[PDB]
Amino acid sequence: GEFRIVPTTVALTMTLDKLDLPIVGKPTSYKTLPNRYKDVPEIGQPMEPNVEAVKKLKPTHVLSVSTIKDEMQPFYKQLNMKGYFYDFDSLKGMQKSITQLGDQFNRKAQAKELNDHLNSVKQKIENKAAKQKKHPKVLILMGVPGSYLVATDKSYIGDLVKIAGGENVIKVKDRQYISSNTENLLNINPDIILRLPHGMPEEVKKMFQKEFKQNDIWKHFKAVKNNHVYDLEEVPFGITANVDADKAMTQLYDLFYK
Numbered sequence: 001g002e003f004r005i006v007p008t009t010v011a012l013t014m015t016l017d018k019l020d021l022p023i024v025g026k027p028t029s030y031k032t033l034p035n036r037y038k039d040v041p042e043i044g045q046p047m048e049p050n051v052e053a054v055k056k057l058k059p060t061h062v063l064s065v066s067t068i069k070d071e072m073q074p075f076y077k078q079l080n081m082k083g084y085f086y087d088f089d090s091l092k093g094m095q096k097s098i099t100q101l102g103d104q105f106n107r108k109a110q111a112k113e114l115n116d117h118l119n120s121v122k123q124k125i126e127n128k129a130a131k132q133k134k135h136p137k138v139l140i141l142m143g144v145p146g147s148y149l150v151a152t153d154k155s156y157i158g159d160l161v162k163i164a165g166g167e168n169v170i171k172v173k174d175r176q177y178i179s180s181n182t183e184n185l186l187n188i189n190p191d192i193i194l195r196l197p198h199g200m201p202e203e204v205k206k207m208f209q210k211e212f213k214q215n216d217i218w219k220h221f222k223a224v225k226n227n228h229v230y231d232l233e234e235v236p237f238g239i240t241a242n243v244d245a246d247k248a249m250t251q252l253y254d255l256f257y258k
């Protein structure tokens, strides 16, 4: 009956805190984690947790997300444990994952409460957006160390943009993020460009700064000429959904309509 849970991502760690659940290990991260986990040991960075550190804690459940399912497969092989890859690529996906965690770990009531609140904020933002006469066309960039990608509707930020009343200029939908060259950025006409950082936010922002100066295409974008290029903070605007989606939805709506 006793659970020993290791969340391997920051979003999963924050979700377990909302569900009032103790954990035996936590991800290594520069982000703020819940205070109740201050004394639990770190088991490595979310994209490459330490197999032997995790095994040392004798867990019953080691938890990851769907966004990096394929690349986490070797980890789980060496661990020799069941892969859990909760859907955190949308509001609806994360709501389903919260219910599942409530069911697995005896926190049904806590899960319902969190879900009702997120649902209520989402519906309210959706209702406001629907009353707006105009909707901005949006291009979403996800910058990682070394390069940038383009976020689709299948990604969390794509879902937020949709909820808040934007129209993604990128229409392909079969993966969360695609090469900056996959859809070609000379066929689109965004009112707004969003730039989200990942992994090494400092390296990423300077990378975005150099790109927009150096690559000749950007100066020709009306979003650039009109100063509607926005750098979003990685918290709450992360590479997956998180329980602060209430703040993300509200903030993005307020950015779009101001």
Ligand code: HEM
Residues within 6 Å of the ligand: 008, 009, 010, 011, 012, 027, 028, 029, 030, 031, 045, 046, 047, 065, 067, 068, 144, 145, 146, 176, 177, 198, 199, 200, 239, 240
């Ligand atoms: C060169 C490319 C990349 C590098 C070097 C990198 C590095 C990192 C780092 C340092 C973190 C931990 C951030 C922290 O301290 O909290 C992280 C987390 C994560 N990354 Fe990446 N990343 C890269 C690309 C990607 C891409 C393309 C994806 C998705 C397709 C991805 C998915 C994730 C996920 C799901 C997490 C966990 C988020 C959480 O903790 O809630 N990464 N990565």
